[PDB]
Design goal:
protein fibril, little secondary structure, fvggvv, rippled sheet, mixed chirality, about 0% helix, binds 1,1,1,3,3,3-hexafluoropropan-2-ol, about 0% strand
């Protein structure tokens, strides 16, 4: 699972 970037 690759986290998103805000
Ligand atoms: O989501 C993938 C998984 F499932 F963990 F292998 C990734 F390698 F990209 F992290
Ligand atoms: O999962 C959220 C997302 F979607 F990437 F914005 C978090 F901000 F936490 F990364
Ligand atoms: O935008 C993605 C979603 F859709 F929520 F899965 C993330 F995982 F990055 F948050
Ligand atoms: O990355 C932010 C988000 F999360 F999409 F709202 C930005 F506002 F910068 F687009």
């Amino acid at each position: 699972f690759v986290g998103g970037v805000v």
